[PDB]
RNA sequence: UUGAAAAGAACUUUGAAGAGAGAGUUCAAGAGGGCGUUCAAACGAGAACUUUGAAUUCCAUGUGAACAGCAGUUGAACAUGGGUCUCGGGUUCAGAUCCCCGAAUCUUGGAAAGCGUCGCGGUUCCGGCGGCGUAAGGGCUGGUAGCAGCCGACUU
RNA sequence: AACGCAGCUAGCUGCGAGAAUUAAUGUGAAUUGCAGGACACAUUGAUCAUCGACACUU
């Protein structure tokens, strides 16, 4: 009687297609009743059917993306959509590795002259 | 009580104007019910709507005047308002004369009443306005032929 | 006095926030005192009103000691309708009269699993102190 | 000997009463409240009695229709049982009435389609073709049906119950109907009748499922006045206070209807229409279409101004008529009456009787031992 | 439209698969046979009644015959 | 060289062999049969076209064409179609006139849909 | 910017209505929804002006607050519905070289269609069946100064 | 910038053919002009807030 997303998450791909097909046919019949004389009960069903269609399509679209996420887990090149978004300026800045590199000359100075902790008595 | 619609459909169905449609004065309630072309066709067949006859414009008076003017009754000197050339173009009068007098000359040639050599001379004289009518021309031809006959005898 | 830097005492800001509140916030504002006998039993001064609770009116024209059941909670107008608080329209029809929840006393309470949990939470706060 | 009716009713009423004089109704004196005096001269022979005599022929038709209605309802009461589909019940009742009345075109027949309404539904519901609704034990049914002889109509309805729990509600509605019938009288304001009915009805309480409801009238619904070939003659009898002050008159026929609801007390339209009637005021409107004019012909040649339903049209053999009917309703020739329903989960009850106000007395023609 | 001139040619055209029907018209001075093919309508004019009646009997089997008159 | 002009020589051009697909999955088709036909029409001028010249009147999507309309009506109702005529209404809607094949009859089909 | 709260004036009575007189709610209405050219007829409550006879504005139905510099039973006003799919005949309240039928890219088409008239059934249903009809200016043909015949408008 | 989307809906506001909203998490019996429809409320939930998954006409 009530379509809940939790029930439909683990169902098979073909089974979802049939449920989508049946719901679409119900909506078309209800539209015919609107143009002719229509019962108050019949008109109110239109909003329930419309939300049920959106709910099933969400499950179908959501499931297919995680299938593609796993396939490209280790590949060097990924589709543009599967990459992170953030901000355009953020995608142009240097990564964590590059930012903290140092030249051989700087490394020697750090080892030879480390900073100290001291107190002046007074 | 208003019959604007029923006087417009009838004119279209009867292929006439709205000044030639007669609607029954005493049958207004029945006519009012009609609202489609199919119903208007029914009432025309039943006598309720009729097409009036055309007004009369007779030509009898002008036909009589034409017969009088054929004998010249109303021509006169005080009834003419345009120039003589306007009434009849002189170019048309000349053109008619040339065709009448050139057709006659050709026919005489086939019947061997004239020779070609005399024919050429007469043709140029006709172009020079020597002759005015068929009678004036034929008389000249007869006079010419007689002179030739006498000279031989 | 109030010492918090990030709280306002302005007249115009408080009035605006009260009149334009989301529905979940309006549940907290519409609360009513609990009766003396119930107060000792649960150690809870007040509770938010609900659709099916017995009530008594303590102020206004309809003041009395009769007990009625709540029939509808109208949050848009901040009013509730009770069983027998009613007057007659000109035609002869009967209409309910709105009562603000702060002017009523709860005599009996609806009991559900979630409501029992809110009651328990309030009891611990007082004892800790 | 005098023709005796068979176990399944089949003899026509006229055969059972060859002479012409049909059984009479319940006769009672008019309400004694006449601004401080009584007209006990109405019971004695006078010019009132002379006028009354002049209408004996009319009264006979009403008595005949009442006899047929009583016999039909007695038959229906015996075999009604849970689990049957409503279409079968309607067909059986209609066939039995068609046989007992001995319909002859517009001379005799059924005034309006039989209406069986369940639970929240209060009126104007009959199962169309293709409906699969089965009676249940926890259900209330209202059966309303009528018959007519030469344009004299009788409209009566009762309520049938199975589960004992609805006893108090049925008793309250019946008491209100009886009080309303008692109050009715010649030259009496309708508003006073409505006030009496409301005061009597409001003093009742019911307990179903353990929740305590109050029996209250349905303000929208009301009674009506009956005329020859016209089921509504233009007067309405309210069941509540606050209404017009029209007065009753002698020689008039009225239907006293009481509806009770354990809910809000207002009715709206919820389901598909099934009852249609032709408008008595309207005249000639240009139809402008082939098939709807066949429809209007059939209507004018079988039903006249009496109400019809789609099952009857199907039985006559007509098909694909929905658009023609809708066009007719749009033009204003025919009027659709849709079902009326209360809030979901409510319960209703309806008792109705038809009374004739005679010059000399008050006769409840529909009255019988059953109710 | 086209006009056939000889009787035999009318038989050969009628046999054609495209031919759909034959209509006969009976005027006061003549009898006309018209066959409806895919692209054209073919007419044979017979001026004498006696020959036409013989011709009608031997029309190709299966072509629907419609008598307009 | 037999000509006084120098023209650019022809060189080998290669086809694309991308290393990743720029878009993960193809976009779903959002103009299916159910979307093509919004509803049927029941006015007073549509009831004269069913009982006389065997036609049905529909309201359809604005972006459809005569070829798409014929396939959609065929599949949904299992019927044959001969011609489609379309106009865009003054209020911005599209109305299509469809003519049924001789074997089929509009009246029974319309009754099945619920129109009549 | 009515009132604490619509409790936003049931019912009776005059008028076609707009408007009033009584009642009713409220602490308060001294708070009442921007409030602290001529003659006849018909229809109509009503005619110098509407209709009939005689001398998106498109198309139906409904109305008469406002508007149409007088009126209005009327409107391009106000409200609710509808309408735009290489030739000849049909068809709508409003669309047709676009819909339907038929042909295509002197004779076949062609009389079966169209148009006149005279009839027979029918009454919101038959969109149904027949009878008839369509003084002087010039031509032509047949043959001594030519003639036989018919013709033929205009001009001076 | 344009055009669309509500049972009754012109504007403002919200959204994009999944179109006055889908999923997820908090909360815990309403929304309301009228009707209809829901909802053990944990064999898991009306409504609002938040928002990280999905979708996004020209
Ligand atoms: Co009744």
mmCIF file of N, CA and C in Angstrom, chain A residues 75-118:
data_model
loop_
_atom_site.group_PDB
_atom_site.id
_atom_site.type_symbol
_atom_site.label_atom_id
_atom_site.label_comp_id
_atom_site.label_asym_id
_atom_site.label_seq_id
_atom_site.Cartn_x
_atom_site.Cartn_y
_atom_site.Cartn_z
ATOM 1 N N UNK A 75 42.061 3.042 -10.784
ATOM 2 C CA UNK A 75 42.536 3.515 -12.077
ATOM 3 C C UNK A 75 43.048 4.948 -11.978
ATOM 4 N N UNK A 76 44.100 5.243 -12.746
ATOM 5 C CA UNK A 76 44.697 6.576 -12.727
ATOM 6 C C UNK A 76 43.733 7.635 -13.246
ATOM 7 N N UNK A 77 43.015 7.334 -14.321
ATOM 8 C CA UNK A 77 42.102 8.279 -14.947
ATOM 9 C C UNK A 77 40.661 7.918 -14.615
ATOM 10 N N UNK A 78 39.896 8.909 -14.169
ATOM 11 C CA UNK A 78 38.501 8.749 -13.806
ATOM 12 C C UNK A 78 37.634 9.675 -14.648
ATOM 13 N N UNK A 79 36.374 9.313 -14.880
ATOM 14 C CA UNK A 79 35.442 10.248 -15.516
ATOM 15 C C UNK A 79 35.384 11.564 -14.752
ATOM 16 N N UNK A 80 35.057 12.638 -15.472
ATOM 17 C CA UNK A 80 35.082 13.965 -14.865
ATOM 18 C C UNK A 80 34.068 14.083 -13.734
ATOM 19 N N UNK A 81 32.888 13.486 -13.903
ATOM 20 C CA UNK A 81 31.850 13.592 -12.882
ATOM 21 C C UNK A 81 32.255 12.900 -11.583
ATOM 22 N N UNK A 82 32.954 11.767 -11.673
ATOM 23 C CA UNK A 82 33.314 11.012 -10.476
ATOM 24 C C UNK A 82 34.419 11.671 -9.660
ATOM 25 N N UNK A 83 35.054 12.717 -10.173
ATOM 26 C CA UNK A 83 36.107 13.410 -9.450
ATOM 27 C C UNK A 83 35.510 14.420 -8.473
ATOM 28 N N UNK A 84 36.265 14.819 -7.450
ATOM 29 C CA UNK A 84 35.720 15.751 -6.459
ATOM 30 C C UNK A 84 35.497 17.125 -7.070
ATOM 31 N N UNK A 85 34.588 17.883 -6.455
ATOM 32 C CA UNK A 85 34.206 19.186 -6.986
ATOM 33 C C UNK A 85 34.902 20.335 -6.266
ATOM 34 N N UNK A 86 34.649 20.494 -4.964
ATOM 35 C CA UNK A 86 35.247 21.565 -4.176
ATOM 36 C C UNK A 86 34.981 22.920 -4.821
ATOM 37 N N UNK A 87 36.048 23.613 -5.207
ATOM 38 C CA UNK A 87 35.955 24.905 -5.868
ATOM 39 C C UNK A 87 37.032 24.951 -6.943
ATOM 40 N N UNK A 88 36.809 25.782 -7.964
ATOM 41 C CA UNK A 88 37.749 25.853 -9.078
ATOM 42 C C UNK A 88 39.129 26.294 -8.607
ATOM 43 N N UNK A 89 39.184 27.288 -7.720
ATOM 44 C CA UNK A 89 40.463 27.756 -7.196
ATOM 45 C C UNK A 89 41.147 26.690 -6.347
ATOM 46 N N UNK A 90 40.376 25.939 -5.557
ATOM 47 C CA UNK A 90 40.965 24.881 -4.740
ATOM 48 C C UNK A 90 41.584 23.776 -5.583
ATOM 49 N N UNK A 91 40.994 23.461 -6.735
ATOM 50 C CA UNK A 91 41.547 22.411 -7.580
ATOM 51 C C UNK A 91 42.854 22.812 -8.251
ATOM 52 N N UNK A 92 43.233 24.091 -8.216
ATOM 53 C CA UNK A 92 44.468 24.543 -8.842
ATOM 54 C C UNK A 92 45.648 24.651 -7.881
ATOM 55 N N UNK A 93 45.425 24.567 -6.572
ATOM 56 C CA UNK A 93 46.521 24.698 -5.623
ATOM 57 C C UNK A 93 47.301 23.390 -5.503
ATOM 58 N N UNK A 94 48.507 23.493 -4.946
ATOM 59 C CA UNK A 94 49.406 22.350 -4.858
ATOM 60 C C UNK A 94 48.949 21.363 -3.789
ATOM 61 N N UNK A 95 49.272 20.091 -4.008
ATOM 62 C CA UNK A 95 48.894 19.033 -3.085
ATOM 63 C C UNK A 95 49.792 19.047 -1.850
ATOM 64 N N UNK A 96 49.415 18.231 -0.861
ATOM 65 C CA UNK A 96 50.109 18.227 0.425
ATOM 66 C C UNK A 96 51.578 17.842 0.287
ATOM 67 N N UNK A 97 51.888 16.873 -0.574
ATOM 68 C CA UNK A 97 53.278 16.465 -0.757
ATOM 69 C C UNK A 97 54.144 17.614 -1.263
ATOM 70 N N UNK A 98 53.703 18.290 -2.321
ATOM 71 C CA UNK A 98 54.528 19.332 -2.927
ATOM 72 C C UNK A 98 54.767 20.509 -1.990
ATOM 73 N N UNK A 99 53.785 20.858 -1.155
ATOM 74 C CA UNK A 99 53.899 22.070 -0.348
ATOM 75 C C UNK A 99 54.998 21.990 0.709
ATOM 76 N N UNK A 100 55.320 20.800 1.216
ATOM 77 C CA UNK A 100 56.241 20.698 2.344
ATOM 78 C C UNK A 100 57.612 20.147 1.957
ATOM 79 N N UNK A 101 57.961 20.172 0.674
ATOM 80 C CA UNK A 101 59.290 19.746 0.259
ATOM 81 C C UNK A 101 60.312 20.835 0.559
ATOM 82 N N UNK A 102 61.563 20.419 0.748
ATOM 83 C CA UNK A 102 62.644 21.349 1.036
ATOM 84 C C UNK A 102 63.884 20.972 0.242
ATOM 85 N N UNK A 103 64.705 21.979 -0.048
ATOM 86 C CA UNK A 103 65.968 21.759 -0.734
ATOM 87 C C UNK A 103 66.994 21.150 0.217
ATOM 88 N N UNK A 104 68.046 20.570 -0.366
ATOM 89 C CA UNK A 104 69.113 19.993 0.446
ATOM 90 C C UNK A 104 69.781 21.043 1.323
ATOM 91 N N UNK A 105 69.865 22.284 0.842
ATOM 92 C CA UNK A 105 70.536 23.334 1.601
ATOM 93 C C UNK A 105 69.762 23.680 2.865
ATOM 94 N N UNK A 106 68.433 23.751 2.764
ATOM 95 C CA UNK A 106 67.609 24.080 3.921
ATOM 96 C C UNK A 106 67.674 22.987 4.979
ATOM 97 N N UNK A 107 67.735 21.721 4.554
ATOM 98 C CA UNK A 107 67.794 20.617 5.507
ATOM 99 C C UNK A 107 69.040 20.697 6.383
ATOM 100 N N UNK A 108 70.184 21.059 5.797
ATOM 101 C CA UNK A 108 71.418 21.134 6.576
ATOM 102 C C UNK A 108 71.324 22.182 7.676
ATOM 103 N N UNK A 109 70.722 23.336 7.378
ATOM 104 C CA UNK A 109 70.636 24.399 8.374
ATOM 105 C C UNK A 109 69.775 23.976 9.556
ATOM 106 N N UNK A 110 68.699 23.234 9.294
ATOM 107 C CA UNK A 110 67.821 22.794 10.373
ATOM 108 C C UNK A 110 68.545 21.854 11.327
ATOM 109 N N UNK A 111 69.312 20.907 10.785
ATOM 110 C CA UNK A 111 70.039 19.967 11.629
ATOM 111 C C UNK A 111 71.127 20.658 12.443
ATOM 112 N N UNK A 112 71.882 21.564 11.820
ATOM 113 C CA UNK A 112 73.037 22.151 12.492
ATOM 114 C C UNK A 112 72.635 23.127 13.591
ATOM 115 N N UNK A 113 71.586 23.918 13.374
ATOM 116 C CA UNK A 113 71.206 24.988 14.298
ATOM 117 C C UNK A 113 69.734 24.880 14.670
ATOM 118 N N UNK A 114 69.379 23.931 15.531
ATOM 119 C CA UNK A 114 67.992 23.845 15.996
ATOM 120 C C UNK A 114 67.690 24.940 17.004
ATOM 121 N N UNK A 115 66.417 25.318 17.078
ATOM 122 C CA UNK A 115 66.000 26.297 18.071
ATOM 123 C C UNK A 115 65.997 25.669 19.460
ATOM 124 N N UNK A 116 66.161 26.509 20.476
ATOM 125 C CA UNK A 116 66.312 26.050 21.848
ATOM 126 C C UNK A 116 65.255 26.681 22.745
ATOM 127 N N UNK A 117 65.173 26.167 23.969
ATOM 128 C CA UNK A 117 64.294 26.694 25.004
ATOM 129 C C UNK A 117 65.150 27.189 26.160
ATOM 130 N N UNK A 118 64.872 28.402 26.630
ATOM 131 C CA UNK A 118 65.704 29.023 27.647
ATOM 132 C C UNK A 118 64.854 29.967 28.483
#
